[PDB]
Structure formats: structure tokens, C-alpha cells
Write a protein that binds this ligand. Structure first.
Ligand code: HEC
Ligand code: NA
Length: 92
């Protein structure tokens, strides 16, 4: 049925699936202290990529659209886990 995302695993996949390169550690900053190349707002109810035709759940946005340039590399449980991780950011 509906996969259950694990935020702790998503914190690791954030790096290994290369999200960190474009979005920094937290959608705001890089480890180096410079601003992220592309911000990521972790608090939208739904996400609509500029090339999409409808709003998506965060995990489905990730499956379809990210990492940009190699979108098929994170789907399914990867996408669920990273969704869960991103939804922890407003507790930062
Ligand atoms: C640079 C090569 C990127 C990599 C690697 C990843 N993302 Fe990305 N992301 C990138 C761009 C240019 C954009 C904008 C897309 C558009 O609408 O044209 C995004 C957007 C996101 C968002 C939405 C952010 C928002 O504030 O609405 C999310 C949630 C997102 N990206 C997630 C994400 C994840 C989980 C990645 C690793 C699997 C990832 N991105 C990689 C550029 C790049
Ligand atoms: Na994907």
C-alpha cells in the first residue's frame, strides 16, 4: 500500500542522491556557508514543478522531477524517505 517514509534514511539519501549539491543541507545554505544554489521551501502542501500540469505530493514531485537531470534515480521508497526528511526542516 502507501509507503511509509523514514526521515532518518531520507537525511542520508539527501546526500547520496545529490540533492545537497543544488539545494544545500537544508534548502537554504551549503555546508560552506554560502546560500544554496536553488532554494527549497519545505513547507508547501503540494509541489508543482514549472513543467508539470498539476500539483503533486512532495514524494511524487521528487519521483517525477528530482534529482533534476537524473530523475529516475530517486523514486518509490527513496522519494518517500526524502519527503519525510524535508518535512522535518521546519523544526530546524
Ligand atoms: C540541481 C542539478 C538539482 C538537483 C541535484 C536536485 N534539484 Fe530539486 N530542484 C532543482 C530546480 C532547478 C528546481 C526548480 C524546478 C522547477 O520548478 O523548475 C528544483 C526544485 C525542487 C523542489 C521544489 C522546491 C520548492 O520550493 O517548491 C524540491 C522539493 C526538490 N527540488 C527536491 C529535490 C530532491 C529531493 C533532490 C534529490 C533527490 C533534488 N531536488 C535534486 C534543481 C535540483
Ligand atoms: Na525522481
Amino acid at each position: 500500500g502507501y509507503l511509509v517514509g523514514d526521515a532518518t534514511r531520507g537525511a542520508n539519501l539527501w546526500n547520496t542522491q545529490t540533492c545537497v549539491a543544488c539545494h544545500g543541507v537544508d534548502g537554504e545554505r551549503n555546508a560552506s556557508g554560502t546560500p544554496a544554489l536553488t532554494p527549497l521551501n519545505p513547507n508547501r502542501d503540494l509541489y508543482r514543478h514549472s513543467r508539470d500540469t498539476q500539483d503533486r505530493a512532495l514524494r511524487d514531485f521528487i519521483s517525477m522531477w528530482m534529482p533534476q537531470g537524473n530523475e529516475g534515480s530517486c523514486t518509490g521508497q527513496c522519494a518517500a524517505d526524502i519527503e519525510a526528511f524535508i518535512r522535518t526542516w521546519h523544526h530546524h
